Amino acid sequence: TTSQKHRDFVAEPMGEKPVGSLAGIGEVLGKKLEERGFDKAYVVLGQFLVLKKDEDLFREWLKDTCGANAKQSRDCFGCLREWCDAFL
Amino acid sequence: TTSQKHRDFVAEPMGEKPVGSLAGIGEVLGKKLEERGFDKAYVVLGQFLVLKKDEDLFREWLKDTCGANAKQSRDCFGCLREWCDAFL
Amino acid sequence: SSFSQHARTSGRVAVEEVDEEGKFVRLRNKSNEDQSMGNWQIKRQNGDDPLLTYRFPPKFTLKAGQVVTIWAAGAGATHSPPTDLVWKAQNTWGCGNSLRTALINSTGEEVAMRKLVRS
């Protein structure tokens, strides 16, 4: 159901992990996000929080920022929601 | 150095504390932030993360958002920074 | 194990192991320095059940790399400080699909937590 990257991120607090540590973000999307400014995982976390944990708004923002597709956006959103419910 | 409210907030994860739980945020500031949309502690935390933990930018945004002063903004920034250092 | 573990540690002591059936809770000093845990507390929340709090003795030391295991009364272990403390006042740590274990210092600050969630 969930990739190993997802579980690895959810297991422990993010701290200062690179944006590439999120589930569903690889080298390409990671590079685009870093160019956009969100060059740390917790920054994407904060942008997730600002949209008040709404799935549609976060998925659409991610798609418009980097160009991800349905599966990558879904995995990133699910990982972030689980991390929030496990640590926040 | 810090008021009791600051210690109370820094002690534990925010969870679902309302904006009124933030150190340096009172009834007037809390009401203003809730009117703006920042209706929970985690929203302010996410907005703090988006500005990459910068003191100046965070305090400026707070000042332009609710009209808080130097003391309240300083307390808010300090409490959020220490909470991030403790749990995030 | 059907249980996913999520762990956070801010001090020298981490919540090393949490029993799935509520028999014991095992903590370890993952630092090279001994930690004094006088008046320290363990907070256990099992779903919506009322919080269960265990209190350490007013003076207690966990040396570097060592383990202290707080056993329940129903575990049938042998009480033997400083390595094995038995909670005779509580039958078991409790069971359910939401088990949160937090370590709290003498000042009331949460220094570690380990939460297990089952589908």
Curated annotation (Swiss-Prot), chains A, B:
Free-text comment about domains: Has a helix-hairpin-helix (HhH) structural motif conserved among proteins that bind non-specifically to DNA.
Disease field: Nestor-Guillermo progeria syndrome: An atypical progeroid syndrome characterized by normal development in the first years of life, later followed by the emergence of generalized lipoatrophy, severe osteoporosis, and marked osteolysis. The atrophic facial subcutaneous fat pad and the marked osteolysis of the maxilla and mandible result in a typical pseudosenile facial appearance with micrognathia, prominent subcutaneous venous patterning, a convex nasal ridge, and proptosis. Cognitive development is completely normal.
Main location: nucleus
Source organism per UniProt: Homo sapiens
Lineage of the species this protein comes from: Eukaryota, Metazoa, Chordata, Craniata, Vertebrata
Keywords associated with the record: Acetylation, Chromosome, Cytoplasm, Disease variant, DNA-binding, Host-virus interaction, Nucleus, Osteoporosis, Phosphoprotein
Effect of K52A: No effect on LEMD3/MAN1 binding. Enhances histone H1/H3 binding
Keyword Aminoacyl-tRNA synthetase set for record: no
Gene responsible for this protein: BANF1
Keyword Nucleus: yes
Known outcome of mutating R36E: Reduces LEMD3/MAN1 binding
Name the UniProt record assigns to this protein: Barrier-to-autointegration factor
Result for mutant: C79A: No effect on histone H1/H3 and LEMD3/MAN1 binding
Outcome recorded upon mutating V28A: No effect on histone H1/H3 binding
Superkingdom of source: Eukaryota
Effect noted on mutating K32E: No effect on histone H1/H3 binding
UniProtKB/Swiss-Prot annotation, chain C:
Residues recorded with modification Phosphothreonine: T69, T78, T83
Comp. bias regions, Polar residues: 1-8
Effect of T61P: Found in patient with atrial fibrillation
Phenotype when changing R100P: In EDMD2 and FPLD2; interacts with itself and with wild-type LMNA and LMNB1; reduced binding to SUN1; abnormal nuclear localization; forms nuclear foci in about 13% of cultured skin fibroblasts from heterozygous patients; no effect on protein level
Domain LTD: 1-118
Disease linked to the protein: Emery-Dreifuss muscular dystrophy 2, autosomal dominant: A form of Emery-Dreifuss muscular dystrophy, a degenerative myopathy characterized by weakness and atrophy of muscle without involvement of the nervous system, early contractures of the elbows, Achilles tendons and spine, and cardiomyopathy associated with cardiac conduction defects.
Name of this protein: Prelamin-A/C
Stretch of the intact protein here: 428 to 546 of 664
